[PDB]
Symmetry: C2
Subunit: 123 residues, 2 copies
């Protein structure tokens, strides 16, 4: 059902766990079939599991960690701060991101928005 504030915290922490190990099929499954993703926010969205799997395969030697608590509301929404560590062309970098997610009545991510730009990059 529409996750409770407590459930949202758990689902969102799980999300970073999956991105960290790189289990693309498990990540993809966390999304609704017609979910949209806006990463980075400001860019046109990607819609549906096909495009989202492609999106995550493309991006995912990467590690991600929650750098603060997941902030959850009572209406199926949550926001969380985290860092991603990569190695861009031999050169290793870090990106500080904040994800805002809206879940559906099935506990699946209906919409996801990532806030970041080059100002949060450290390469």
């Amino acid at each position: 059902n529409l996750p409770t504030a407590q459930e949202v915290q758990g689902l969102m922490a799980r999300f970073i766990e999956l991105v960290d190990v790189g289990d693309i099929e498990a990540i993809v499954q966390m999304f609704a079939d017609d979910a949209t993703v806006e990463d980075p926010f400001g860019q046109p969205p990607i819609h549906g599991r096909e495009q989202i799997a492609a999106f995550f395969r493309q991006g995912l030697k990467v590690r991600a960690c929650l750098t603060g608590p997941v902030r959850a509301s009572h209406n199926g929404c949550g926001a969380m701060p985290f860092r991603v560590e990569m190695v861009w062309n031999g050169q290793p970098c870090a990106l500080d991101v904040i994800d805002v997610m809206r879940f559906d009545e099935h506990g699946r991510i209906q919409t996801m928005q990532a806030y970041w730009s080059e100002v949060n990059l450290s390469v």
Copy 2:
């Protein structure tokens, strides 16, 4: 004008500075005249400077600090993690919050949403 990613970081850091010292008139002025505020997200919004000043006077022995970098996009949007330390009825508490703000073409906060619930409270 529509702030650049760099300007958004600066405006948002400024916001926490103002909340920390408790300068209500300066905070109020950071908002557009007809801005809406949703704090906590999930609650009906408050609209316009009058209601927002009332809102901030009501809430503001409080200290606030950025607990991570401000994530900014190129379309006048930003999100930031921070903590507020109060003392609720003699008993001192802390709230971890994430604010998402949209600015207008004047560099003023057009809309503000705060993500938090009792799961982020530590009293």
